[PDB]
């Protein structure tokens, strides 16, 4: 697995998007090790609320505890291994297994065992039979992540330089809410194909989405046909030590939404921008009302403005279960929140007309990685190469001067290669000592 990504993340073997054995290896070195998105506070707001989530191929119950904390457990009974919960979300003080009737608390503890007194006696120790717990649960402004590896860096350190870019929308805007339920659909593409598209693909917008731009008159109509750069400038792209990265298209708060959404959204963002400039400064207040497209390593992607939150849940090397949520700013009028929620699905949900265009790209790439001759072709991530900077006075991380660029592809794949060639976090750290140089 040593030479799948070249130096500086410049090239990737197409095989990575189709190889079966590599997928198995990723379940060990990517999904067993990294922070994975679970849910938002707003989806489990009250004690006993739970959602099912996937962490890689595994399923977990994510439960609001009586003390207000959140714990998550593999969705598997400790007796004979039956799946415990079949609802996608709900409220419950405990979970009873339908096979033999073992009853667990929302804290994962084994509480009740039918025939315990009559048949088990001292042959059972319930304290040893609690649900298998996810050992690390942390949040970033309400967004809750889990990790199977107790040695992982804290979530905030894992976000690294990416956190600074997220803060105007995620931290300083007065609170976000994730609007459920998510759209869910299965797509015949590798999880990495979506992850790379969202981490940094500004280049595709004007070409892949030419028809969508004409029909809906999105603000992105400026780059239609890849003929001209945005009048606002080429934007930015950044990447970070642990692989997260994103592009910034200045001012594009309505993102991939159609013309009917633009006036009201732009007015809302412009008004808050004016307030925010006094608190966090002009540049960051502008970031607040710009379009950010990114990936929180490995498989959680987002758009700001046309506010979307996505999980590329791996099923196998050629199959992904795609989850799509909208998010809203807490202080938006309720009617605007509802319009945003519908508009996200309209563009990129299971019946999203932009999503149709994107999927057209994702599936064939992944299919070609499965084919013997074609799998040896390199993908190239050369756009902006040789011009990225580190230690800029204004913009942290490794930064390029264009959202149409592959700065964040290179950072994503560097981190990916470091993980697949490492057995643990300490080895990843050694492999990443010179990540910015």
């Amino acid at each position: 697995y040593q030479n799948l990504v070249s130096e500086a993340g410049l090239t990737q073997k197409l095989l990575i998007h189709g190889d079966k054995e590599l997928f198995q290896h990723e379940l060990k070195t990517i999904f067993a090790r990294n922070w994975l998105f679970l849910t938002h506070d707003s989806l489990i707001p009250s004690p006993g609320d739970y959602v099912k989530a996937k962490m890689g191929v595994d399923e977990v119950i994510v439960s609001r505890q009586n003390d207000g904390s959140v714990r998550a457990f593999l969705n598997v009974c400790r007796h004979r291994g039956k799946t415990l919960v079949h609802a996608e979300a709900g409220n419950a003080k405990g979970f009873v297994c339908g096979y033999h009737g073992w009853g667990y608390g929302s804290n994962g503890e084994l509480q009740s065992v039918p025939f315990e007194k009559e048949l088990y006696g001292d042959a059972i120790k319930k304290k040893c039979l609690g649900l298998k717990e996810v050992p690390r649960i942390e949040s970033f402004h309400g967004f809750i992540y889990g990790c199977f590896d107790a040695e992982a860096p804290p979530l905030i350190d894992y976000l690294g330089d990416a956190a600074w870019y997220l803060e105007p929308t995620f931290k300083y805007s007065g609170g976000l809410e994730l609007v459920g339920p998510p759209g869910k659909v299965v797509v015949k593409a590798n999880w990495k194909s979506f992850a790379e598209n969202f981490v940094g693909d500004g280049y595709h917008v004007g070409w892949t989405h030419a028809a969508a731009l004409r029909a809906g008159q999105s603000v992105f109509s400026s780059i239609a046909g890849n003929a001209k750069l945005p009048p606002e400038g080429a934007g930015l792209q950044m990447t970070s030590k642990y692989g997260s990265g994103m592009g910034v298209f200045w001012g594009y708060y309505s993102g991939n939404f159609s013309a009917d959404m633009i006036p009201d959204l732009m007015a809302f963002g412009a008004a808050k921008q004016e307030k925010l400039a006094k608190e966090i400064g002009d540049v960051r207040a502008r970031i607040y009302r710009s379009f950010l497209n990114g990936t929180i390593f490995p498989n959680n992607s987002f758009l700001t403005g046309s506010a979307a939150f996505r999980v590329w849940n791996p099923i196998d090397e050629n199959t992904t279960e795609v989850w799509t949520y909208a998010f809203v700013e807490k202080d938006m009028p309720e009617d605007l929140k509802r319009r945003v929620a519908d508009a996200v699905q309209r563009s990129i949900g299971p019946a999203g007309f932009w999503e149709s265009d994107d999927n057209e790209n994702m599936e064939t790439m992944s299919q070609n990685g499965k084919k013997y001759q074609s799998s040896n072709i390199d993908q190239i991530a050369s756009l902006g190469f040789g011009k990225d900077v580190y230690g800029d006075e204004c913009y942290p991380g490794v930064v390029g001067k264009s959202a149409i660029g592959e700065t964040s592809y290179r950072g994503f794949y560097r981190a990916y290669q470091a993980h697949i060639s490492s057995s643990n976090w300490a080895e990843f750290e050694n492999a990443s000592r010179n990540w910015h140089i």
Partner: protein, 194 residues
């Protein structure tokens, strides 16, 4: 014919009432008329005449809605967060945008031309008891979509419609609602007009 929802433990109040609506609303002439209407609509969609469909079969006041319902426990009660996401929830302008995207020569996904075949069954109809120009219509759809040599996707749905009679003899769709039965479609997308 009514359903006793105390004894019929799996039946929602909503579904029980709709069943009664369509039971008592049976009219032989209306059945024939609406069957013809839905067959014409499906033919028009199958040949991808989306502009003709939007202009002649869809009313200006259209609400075109397809939901995906989150799977909740039958027995819990407490969790009251919205249980439905709108895969479609479109007004006329939003349908126009979608139609123009479908037909654009630079919609890369639509080259080569995709193939649609629609099967409409189990048609029932009832005139609204207040607004006689409004026809409630239920029908089941199988939609087969084939593309790119070996891609085949089959969709299954119940369409709950309101149609309106127009001055001049036409009939146009004012609401279509679909509670899509698969929570996670395994059809690549749901980018079809159900």
């Amino acid at each position: 014919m009514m359903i006793n929802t105390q004894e019929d433990k799996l039946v929602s109040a909503h579904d029980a009432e709709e069943f009664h609506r369509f039971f008592v609303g049976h009219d032989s002439d209306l059945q024939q008329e609406v069957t013809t209407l839905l067959t014409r609509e499906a033919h028009l969609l199958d040949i991808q005449a989306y502009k003709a469909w939007l202009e002649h079969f869809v009313a200006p006041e259209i609400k075109y809605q397809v939901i995906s319902r989150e799977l909740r426990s039958t027995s819990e009660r407490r969790y009251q967060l919205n249980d439905a996401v709108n895969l479609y929830n479109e007004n006329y302008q939003q349908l126009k945008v979608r139609v123009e995207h479908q037909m654009d020569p630079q919609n890369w996904a639509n080259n080569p031309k995709i193939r649609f075949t629609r099967f409409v069954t189990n048609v029932t109809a009832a005139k609204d008891k207040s607004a006689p120009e409004i026809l409630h219509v239920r029908s089941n759809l199988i939609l087969h979509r084939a593309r790119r040599e070996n891609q085949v996707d089959v969709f299954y749905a119940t369409r709950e419609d309101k149609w309106k009679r127009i001055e001049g003899g036409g009939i146009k769709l004012v609401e279509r609602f679909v509670d899509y039965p698969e929570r996670i479609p395994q059809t690549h997308n749901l980018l079809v007009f159900l």
